[PDB]
Design a protein around this ligand. Sequence first.
Ligand SMILES: N[C@@H](CCS)C(=O)O
Ligand SMILES: N[C@@H](CCS)C(=O)O
Ligand SMILES: [K+]
Ligand SMILES: [K+]
Ligand SMILES: [Y+3]
Ligand SMILES: [Zn+2]
Ligand SMILES: [Zn+2]
Lengths: 560, 556
Amino acid sequence: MRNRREVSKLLSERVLLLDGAYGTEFMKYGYDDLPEELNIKAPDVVLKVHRSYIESGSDVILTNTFGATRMKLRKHGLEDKLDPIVRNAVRIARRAAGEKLVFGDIGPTGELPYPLGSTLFEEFYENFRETVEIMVEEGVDGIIFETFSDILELKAAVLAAREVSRDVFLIAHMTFDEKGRSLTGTDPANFAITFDELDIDALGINCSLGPEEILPIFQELSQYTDKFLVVEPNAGKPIVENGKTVYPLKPHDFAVHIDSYYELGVNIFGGCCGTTPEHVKLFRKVLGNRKPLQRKKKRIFAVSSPSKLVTFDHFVVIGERINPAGRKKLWAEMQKGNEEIVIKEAKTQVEKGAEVLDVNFGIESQIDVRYVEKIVQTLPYVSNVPLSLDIQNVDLTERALRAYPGRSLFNSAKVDEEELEMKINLLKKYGGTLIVLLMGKDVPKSFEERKEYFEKALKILERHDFSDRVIFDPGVLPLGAEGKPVEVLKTIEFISSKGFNTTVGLSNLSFGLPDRSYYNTAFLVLGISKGLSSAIMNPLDETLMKTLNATLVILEKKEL
Amino acid sequence: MRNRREVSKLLSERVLLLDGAYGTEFMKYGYDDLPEELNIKAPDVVLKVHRSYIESGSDVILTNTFGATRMKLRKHGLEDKLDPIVRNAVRIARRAAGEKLVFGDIGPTGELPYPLGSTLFEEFYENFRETVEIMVEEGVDGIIFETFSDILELKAAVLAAREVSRDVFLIAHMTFDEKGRSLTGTDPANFAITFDELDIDALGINCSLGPEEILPIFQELSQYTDKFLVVEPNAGKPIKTVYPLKPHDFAVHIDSYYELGVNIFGGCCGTTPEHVKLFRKVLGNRKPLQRKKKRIFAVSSPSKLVTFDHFVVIGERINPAGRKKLWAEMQKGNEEIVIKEAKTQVEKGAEVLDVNFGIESQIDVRYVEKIVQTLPYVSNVPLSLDIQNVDLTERALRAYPGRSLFNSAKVDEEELEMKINLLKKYGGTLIVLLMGKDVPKSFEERKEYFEKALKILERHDFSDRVIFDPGVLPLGAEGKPVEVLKTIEFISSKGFNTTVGLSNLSFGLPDRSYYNTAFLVLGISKGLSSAIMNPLDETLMKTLNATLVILEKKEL
Ligand SMILES: N[C@@H](CCS)C(=O)O
Ligand SMILES: N[C@@H](CCS)C(=O)O
Ligand SMILES: [K+]
Ligand SMILES: [K+]
Ligand SMILES: [Y+3]
Ligand SMILES: [Zn+2]
Ligand SMILES: [Zn+2]
């Protein structure tokens, strides 16, 4: 068993060759059984296939465990054979490989996450945890999650693997259709942006498409991560001939693509379904001995849901409405675990132009933690958009972040050493960006005071290597409570000038005032003129939204 | 006959004494006839009274003609005696004065301007012109309009006088009540700003109040004009014979008027030669004090002075373009509809009203002259006169009761000289639109027009009487409002007021209220000081108020 430090060192020195397909090989040997069952029924066939790749020059082989998790095995009446299936697979692969690397191979369950399917984050997490336990015990040199179609299920798999072992080399893959999207809508930039910041060692792509079709998809992935890169295309895109799936790409026509992947920074190259030992033999000759290429990676501030990447390069409307403050009905209904009411609020806001939704659960001791976990998992699927998680309690925050399907915005940390560090650390573990509110020991009462908090924040951020993952909220105070909005506008202009995104809790300005719509509208227009890049605001306020649109058109940021 | 250069020279050297009352003196000697009639019926009594004031120390005497104009004499069956009344008055005053100054004295007619009464501007103008001609013929050293209560009537008088003679020394007075207001609502700063820029030589106050009561009113007047200042307080309310304010107490106020820059001091109703004797003893020989006037940019109506030290809403609605019904009433000379539109806009927050007559050549000038005179009285607020025809421009400016804003000259040598000259003659301020031969598109293009304009305005000494309009183009027609916003910020940085025709931004687009609002907020954030806009748009107006509250230009 090699740990992640050893494997990373090896990769830094040499581009490695993976193996070909297993599922599409076994039939050629007269075995059409579920591949994982062969680990018990015919371990000799499994050994032969591994050896076929070792003898073709592979540096790494995958264990015969693609469908070996409880949730998937259950569908085939084999759940009670998890332990021997996985143990035998690892033992067989180790026998074939000798000193070569063995990666524990885990695919997805075929179960969609709730609300598309019935499955909650917690169930996927425990499912992947149990297979990874066996693999780590049996001494794998890494874990690879192949052919994932949904980011929540993949996030669960990575987090479960990392909780079993902080030392194992961990590789996360998605598979993409010909339009460059996963089943639940994630494009390669979103995949990269979301997963780069988790404690995985490598990202990659396998299956669905051939080497030609993957290239631009892989290029986009490579632009947004600095982690190691893996690719395993099919031997051409699958076609049906005389009632069977055929992968028509021959060894030379597949191998010619190696250079193009190498140029994009590939670290491990292999093949998925349709790839045979004949392909791998040629890959071995063509790849030879190469040091991988350095890349940087584009840096962007973006948040995501499964189907939407929201980049802060245009004004971002953050819908404020999922917040039970002053909403007696919503508050009562949240406490009873009503999902439909919150779902309706989400969809309406998006229909009216919210691109991200703030979600707050009021007096958090009064709310069921399981309802928070379900709401957070559900809204990005049903409403399509990313969330701003507006949570006070650090424990509940951890629950929400662990279960969030994408890269969230976390609403909010004040400028306090202890509070900032706690919230930063949670985001470092589970992914995400942070709103930093410019107040602390007290509430600022001028531009200069806000500027001092901003600089204190930057010092704490730099120390935690977190400066690129923040948006600043200068702290809008109520007009009727000596709010002094000119001071906020000065602060917006100042922070924008420094290259940071900004947001405000817009509706705070007009709290306790009649004609709040007009105060909110006037303030938003002024803020945008100073560089304000987003706002938590009411998208159902038609005057606010129409004036916003007019403002963006006028300032040449969009439209007609 | 001294000319105004001669009289000014004298005033620059010494504070002069006027005379006391005539009307109340003639009454007290038992003459209950109109004072002006005595020029025919008892010339020796007129001569006696003038002589008593000269002996008492007056440097200047007033001709006995206070009520001697055609419109006033007609109310007494005496209009056919205008000519002999005024000529005898001047001849008698000259006999009395010797080398001393004789000013032709003209008071108001007692007729209110339409619509408070029935008199139009032109009728007042003709009335004063006739009396000034006779006085100038007979050789006065000046003309003084005493005891005026209305700024339109006074404007007619001063323009009439100046049409007769550009050389005669001209003094314009208003009389103010205890609240510092003329009958039709003009306060001393309004009076000063409106009349200072007309071609008069002095401004002043007489009657209605005593020396003490006039002092703060006179101080206000003194702060807003650099011209010569005159005062003639009355001797209080009589309680008919016996007036309360006697020579010694009246005269002890002279020092306070001297310290405020007074140039001629006299007395009005109830004062006597014995008062003047004391003015002489108290004043002696003093050079007048120098002063620096406060400088502001302001427009006016009889009852309102609007200073551009806060955001000014200029109502756009009296404009028949795209409005078939309004236009049909304008063409049939309907006054009531325009009045209703004016009133509603002011009710909604308009502080100035833009007034445009559409296809001007299809509109009766009488109607225009009538609307222009009427609206400031009934609606209370100043007008932005939005007129293209240069002849109609002259008639509207001439008849306008106050200091107007004139809606628009482009940056063009010929057009500017034309408009500037009319405004120099009739009073007023100018919107200068930043286009010329070509409509500009960029910020630097607009800046070039601005500095072209500044060079033209500086050579005409008109720099201080302009608002700049950067020229807003419709968004659907390659507008680029960002260029306009940059121009506003620049012009503001140079200390100049700005305006825009707001509704042009959103011409042809849907949801125009939202584009108008967004641009207005953005403009204000850059220094925009006014806009021609729709005060009936609740969204616009409420968002405007919010903007000013947020930016600390006004309280919650
Ligand atoms: N490692 C798996 C991939 C299935 S998509 C196999 O080769 O069968
Ligand atoms: N000069 C006139 C003024 C009357 S207000 C007079 O002395 O009678
Ligand atoms: K493989
Ligand atoms: K007098
Ligand atoms: Y620490
Ligand atoms: Zn595959
Ligand atoms: Zn008098």
